[PDB]
Paper text:
Kinesin-1 transports cargo within cells, a process tightly coupled with ATP hydrolysis. Whereas kinesin-1 in solution is mostly loaded with ADP, ADP release is accelerated several thousand-fold upon microtubule binding.
Using these T87A crystals as seeds, we were also able to crystallize wild-type apo-kinesin-1 and the T92V mutant and to determine their structures. Whereas most of the following analysis was performed taking the apo-T87A structure as a reference, identical conclusions could be reached from these wild-type apo-kinesin and T92V isomorphous structures. Taken together, these observations suggest that the P-loop destabilization in nucleotide-free T87A, as well as in the isomorphous structure of wild-type apo-kinesin and of T92V, is the combined result of ADP release and of the loss of the T87-E236 interactions. Whereas we demonstrated that, in the absence of microtubules, apo-kinesin-1 may adopt two conformations, ADP-kinesin-like and tubulin-bound apo-kinesin-like, the effect of tubulin binding is to shift the balance between them and to stabilize the tubulin-bound apo-kinesin-like conformation, from which ADP is released and which is primed to bind ATP6.
Author numbering: 6 to 194, 197 to 239, 243 to 324
The structure:
Amino acid sequence: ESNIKVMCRFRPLNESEVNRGDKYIAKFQGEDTVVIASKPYAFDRVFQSSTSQEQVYNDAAKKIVKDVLEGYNGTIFAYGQTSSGKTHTMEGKLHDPEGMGIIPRIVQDIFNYIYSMDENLEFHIKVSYFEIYLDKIRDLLDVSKTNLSVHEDKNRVPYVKGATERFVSSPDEVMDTIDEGKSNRHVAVMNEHSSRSHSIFLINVKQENTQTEQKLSGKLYLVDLAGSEKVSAEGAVLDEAKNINKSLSALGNVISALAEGSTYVPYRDSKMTRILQDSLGGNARTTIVICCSPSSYNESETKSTLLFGQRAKT
């Protein structure tokens, strides 16, 4: 009923960390569940370390991509604490086909589809890239715009006023756009390269059918979530933490309302969920990719992650 799928990916394992003296802590009872500290967590799918990039994309994103090319909206969330493998899962290696993670594979599927239609279909792809930072909407493609707003049009379709829309005509133009924006996202520092905001990448695929003169329009949102911080330097990083946690809780409330089939879903309680209202719940398709470390050293954070993912399971 909810249309939301939660998928948990576990990472290997690496040499540097085996030499520190860590245990694997994660046990699997089938395609379903991960068991950590004797507690079971069931999801829509659990990927162990042997699961390839391509098969993660196939399970998580491929049919969402098809649906947007058929005129639907969709959303993919990436959640994980640092070193959970969130970036390997979402981006991977640029031009490596085995290889590349979810986002470049999406871009590759879209343009293959386009190239294979050629005659019959005319495409215009608009991309946007912005972050939710300290509850402000900042454009990552134009840093001069640091405080945008969300609105609804006449048919209650959400839009970000003033956000940069770039036309793109090839996979390279798309990845370039991603890179420009990454260079502007708020990161920091006792972890390391720690996102201090949520990022939203929008792929808007507009179609016109040559033969029939009929238009199609689909929105695909790629949301990279900053991890919840258990922070009590009591200054700007504090404000960052409290905002990250609130927005995650607001998202979790909506996610949970949808998963439990609530007749009222509280989209209004945060800027992100207002932005995502036509692409999260209803006839939209969503995958939540939560990334976890197997390491014993990470055990409480992957627990934090798993429980957040559970807010979304029916």
